[PDB]
């Protein structure tokens with residue numbers, strides 16, 4: 485079989501890396517893929533945005549399973565297009581991807597179906613949105629309804645901050661239609677963790693959970709990023725917490741979507757906050773997480789491709805997890821998340837340390853070597869039998885391949901390991 489992985493980030497590298505291990509698979513194609521992936525995937529020069537070429541390529545190249553990585557094509561209905569051409573494709577229809585594409589939709593689903601989440605309301609009027617902020621006071625969380633570059637969320641510590649954000653989103657239409665509607669919701673805290681599941685209609689096959697660091701700097705200080713590192717398991721979260729999340733959030737969410745005529749197939753990603761009142765949904769994503777995939781997938785004992793094919797063909801899914809631990813650290817370009825420059829030479833990015841995989845997020849092969857090609861550059865990912873050893877191993881690996889234009893957080897996983905004990 486030929487498998488197509490769509491996209492170009494670290495999640496897709498992980499996907500291609502895992503698929504490559506399948507006994508079922510003859511070719512793994514990655515469109516567009518990136519140069520970090522060439523050992524695991526034959527790169528196919530088509531953009532995740534180029535839906536017609538993607539569909540036409542898969543159709544004509546005997547691609548028996550397509551796995552979609554990024555959210556935008558899913559949200560824009562790439563799966564419908566694949567299926568119109570009779571291609572076998574894993575991921576949600578445009579109707580189902582709304583659970584990520586429209587935060588208001590997601591909050592309303594949970595309201596309707598008693599799935600626990602932050603108390604919220606949605607607005608299209610600045611005046612009414614501002615009044616509600618002044619009523620609730622700070623802290624309060626302001627979210628653009630649509631994707632908004634991934635920049636649509638402000639956790640406001642003051643009313644002024646919240647109202648300025650509402651100004652941007654609504655009066656200035658900062659993100660256009662994505663911010664023509666806003667969700668205003670309760671600030672939560674506690675342990676934040678990711679619970680993904682393979683889902684088809686009502687069937688839910690949970691994955692091991694992960695946790696990430698979104699803050700640029702150690703001590704979780706500084707601006708937000710697209711993720712500075714992650715790990716699975718999350719030591720300080722019980723198995724009971726996870727199983728309860730699976731039972732009262734993920735499965736009910738999957739059921740709800742069927743009952744809404746938006747039957748969901750793909751990875752349902754639940755971003756959860758373990759509060760003093762228990763898990764509450766911070767967000768839903770309609771696809772594999774980044775950077776979570778990088779520590780979750782490698783823990784899979786099962787063959788990803790077999791799982792997906794069984795799931796899609798309504799067969800028994802035999803999905804097994806390893807006890808091992810995975811921990812990854814992001815190398816980002818100096819300056820990210822603000823301004824950064826592409827082109828810095830950063831070497832081979834090859835580790836000697838064993839049980840390490842570097843998933844490339846923003847690299848380009850240039851002159852026998854790798855240069856930086858984005859803010860977050862690689863996810864150095866180490867596996868081991870305990871959290872703490874995986875933790876120690878990944879930082880061996882990192883120093884080894886570290887280079888001038890890069891930074892990274894040194895404390896990935898340490899608060900977790902500590903709070904566990």
Ligand SMILES: Nc1ncnc2c1ncn2[C@@H]1O[C@H](COP(=O)(O)OP(=O)(O)NP(=O)(O)O)[C@@H](O)[C@H]1O
Nearest residue numbers: 602625634637639669670671672676698766767769
């Ligand atoms: N209700 C809330 N209370 C507290 N923090 C929140 C709340 N909603 C969101 N956040 C925080 O805002 C960040 C989430 O913003 P978001 O854009 O959803 O992040 P993300 O992890 O990049 N999601 P995605 O881009 O889909 O992978 C996290 O640091 C959350 O913990």
Ligand SMILES: [Mg+2]
Nearest residue numbers: 584767768769
């Ligand atoms: Mg999201």
Ligand SMILES: [Mg+2]
Nearest residue numbers: 790794799800
């Ligand atoms: Mg079988």
